[PDB]
């Protein structure tokens, strides 16, 4: 009933991954007029990469002692993770760029995987529970999905699963458009989610 | 042998991936006093992500007709691939960040895979062809955990160096060597450092 929608393509109207995701979102809203949708742009807008300053603050041995400056370094991070915590369903839209994802999406992941917040260690455990994710991806070529010619070259959505998995999001569904099929699948998913 | 060194860690002095690679570069420099080493920072310095404008320009159907504005959108990219074209050996230093590479390195890749420049295609479904020849790559990586290497427990989770191979390979760089330090982290590091000294003396 609460959705965080992460859009990774730098394109606007011409983005296919973005359009497909919004088709899901509109469908889902009709089925649940009560639902909140929060949108997080990581494609058309620059998302800062993790810096050395970020590392120092994020892996501080005594976080309660972080200075004001260090909290500033982690402010966007906190905002990004909060959005996640507040969501029930995470929708990520993304193209396949060079066998992986656009750099902004990688940076988003880099901001949201946080020691003591989304994962812990003692061995690593995940901290997020109750969430599912839907990944809408668009590829220019073909054969990157399960059983495909090029499956092994796919470091986009399969990498996302690993990273989402690390933090606890293990119920993930992937809808891909390569080369109307996906749109229909997305509508069906919107009706039953 | 001209070298291009791409450093992807955001850390400086404390970066292990950077240190290990600098070890290799100094060693190589002792052996080849006349060799040229270019360095490209993608970790401690922000590197623009691909924009819509970059897509419009890089895949414009009639490249000769690109406006000055469009060319400006491709200027950094031209500079970046130029560094690659001028090199015989590419050294990439990178840590594993969330099962992949830091975002800056991803952005560097996104800037260098260029239609009609580092790859091209022909039609059947597009058939791709790499345009880079005679180059090798050395990837020096560092990891906090363990088991991400071949035969490792967590091998299938590795989308860092295995992804880089795939992408470098698409543009023509298929002689690629990976030197990794995991986790006795000092041991993995001393080992990696010995492997690099060896590789410097024979390249
Ligand atoms: C920077 C760049 C890199 C791309 N890399 C790949 C690729 O590795 N594999 C592929 O199948 N398509 C690739 N494509 C094609 C895109 O995946 C395709 O256009 C996709 O539909 C873009 O998503 P969008 O329409 O939401 O922007 C690439 C396109 C661009 C602009
Ligand atoms: C943002 C962040 C993400 C990381 N993600 C991983 C990871 O997925 N797997 C891993 O084994 N280590 C991970 N680490 C640990 C680093 O890979 C390790 O500290 C590495 O040696 C860093 O490289 P450097 O010393 O060149 O900066 C991460 C560290 C940071 C700060
Ligand atoms: C790495 N590979 C294999 C690639 C790289 C680029 C690519 N096309 N890019 C595009 C650019 C602009 C419009 C449409 C496409 C399109 O959807 O094809 C396809 C495959
Ligand atoms: C996701 N995984 C698997 C991780 C994430 C982070 C991690 N440590 N990061 C570090 C941060 C700062 C200094 C040293 C380390 C260090 O080298 O341990 C180890 C494994």
Q: How far does the centroid of ligand 2 lie from the alpha carbon of residue B185, in Å?
A: 13
On whether the CB atoms of residues A40 and A83 are closer than 8 A, the answer is yes
Tally the domains of chain A. 1
Residues 6+ positions from B177 with CB-CB distance below 8 Å: B136, B137, B138, B139, B199
Q: Which residues 34-93 of chain B have a CB within 8 Å of chain A?
A: 44, 46, 48-52, 54-55
* Interface contact A11-B55, CB threshold 8 A: yes
The distance of A12 to chain B (nearest Cα, Å) reads 8
Cα(B137)–Cα(B130) distance, integer angstroms: 15
Beta bridge partners of B39: B5
How far apart CA A108 and CA A83 sit, in angstroms, is 12
How far apart (Å, rounded) are the C-alpha atoms in residues B67 and B71? 6
Please count the helices (runs of H) and the strands (runs of E) in chain A. Answer: 7, 7
Q: How many CA atoms lie within 13 A of B115 on its CB side?
A: 14
> Are A99 and A154 within 8 A, CB to CB?
yes
Are A149 and A143 spatial neighbours (Cβ–Cβ below 8 Å)?
A: yes
Through-space distance between the first and last CA atoms of chain A, rounded to whole angstroms: 9
Q: Given phi > 0 = left and psi -120 to 50 = alpha, else beta, which region is B82?
A: alpha
> CA-nearest residue of chain A to B145?
A123
Contact A163 B98 (CB under 8 A): yes
Residue A41: other Cβ atoms inside 10 A: 17
Query: Angle at CA A49, nearest 5°, toward B170 and A4?
Result: 95
3-state secondary structure of A119: strand
Pocket (CB within 6 angstroms of ligand 1):
A 9, 11, 15-18, 95-99, 138-141; B 50, 55, 110
d(CA B174, CA B151): 21
Strand partners, A125: A120
User: What span, in angstroms and rounded, lies between the C-alpha atoms of B60 and B55?
Assistant: 8
Q: What's the domain range around B47?
A: 1-203
Consult the annotation and say whether A119 binds a ligand: no
Pocket test for ligand 3, best of B54, B59, B164 (most atoms within 8 A of CB): B59
Testing ligand 2's pocket by substitution, the residue of B7, B101, B139, B143 carrying the most ligand atoms inside 8 A of its CB is B143
- The alpha-carbon gap from B114 to the nearest alpha carbon of chain A, in Å, equals 11
CB-CB under 8 Å, B49 with A10: yes
Q: Which residue, by CA, sits nearest to atom 2 of ligand 1? A: A97
CATH number of B5's domain = 3.40.50.360
Joined together, the tokens standing for residue A78 give 């906190």
Residue nearest to atom 30 of ligand 2 (CA): B97
B53 near B59, Cβ under 8 Å? no
Closest CB to B49 among A46, A140, A142: A46
Q: B8 by DSSP, 3-state: which? A: coil
Residues B49, A98: C-beta atoms closer than 8 Å: no
A99 touches chain B (CB under 8 A): yes
Token code pair at residue B77: 């990219």
CB B88 within 8 A of CB B2: yes
**Residue A143, burial from CB neighbour count under 10 angstroms (0-12, 13-18, 19+):** middle
β-bridge partners, B6: B40, B92
């Amino acid at each position: 009933s609460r959705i965080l929608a992460v859009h990774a393509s730098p394109r606007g109207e011409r983005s296919q991954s973005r359009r497909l995701a919004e088709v899901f979102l509109a469908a889902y809203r009709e089925a649940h007029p009560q639902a909140r949708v929060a949108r997080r742009e990581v494609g058309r807008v620059p998302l800062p990469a993790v810096t050395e300053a970020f590392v120092a603050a994020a892996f501080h041995p005594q976080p309660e002692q972080r200075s004001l400056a260090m909290q500033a370094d982690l402010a966007l991070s906190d905002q990004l993770v909060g959005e996640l915590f507040d969501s029930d369903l995470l929708v990520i839209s993304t193209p396949m760029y060079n066998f992986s994802v656009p750099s902004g999406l990688k940076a988003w992941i880099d901001q949201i995987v946080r020691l003591g917040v989304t994962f812990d260690f003692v061995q690593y455990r995940p901290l997020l529970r109750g969430k599912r994710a839907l990944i809408v991806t668009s590829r220019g070529g073909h054969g990157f999905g399960p059983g495909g010619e090029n499956q092994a070259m796919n470091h986009a959505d399969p990498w996302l699963r690993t990273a989402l998995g690390f933090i606890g999001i293990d119920e993930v569904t992937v809808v891909a458009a390569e080369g109307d099929e996906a749109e229909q699948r997305l509508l069906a998913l919107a009706r039953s989610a």
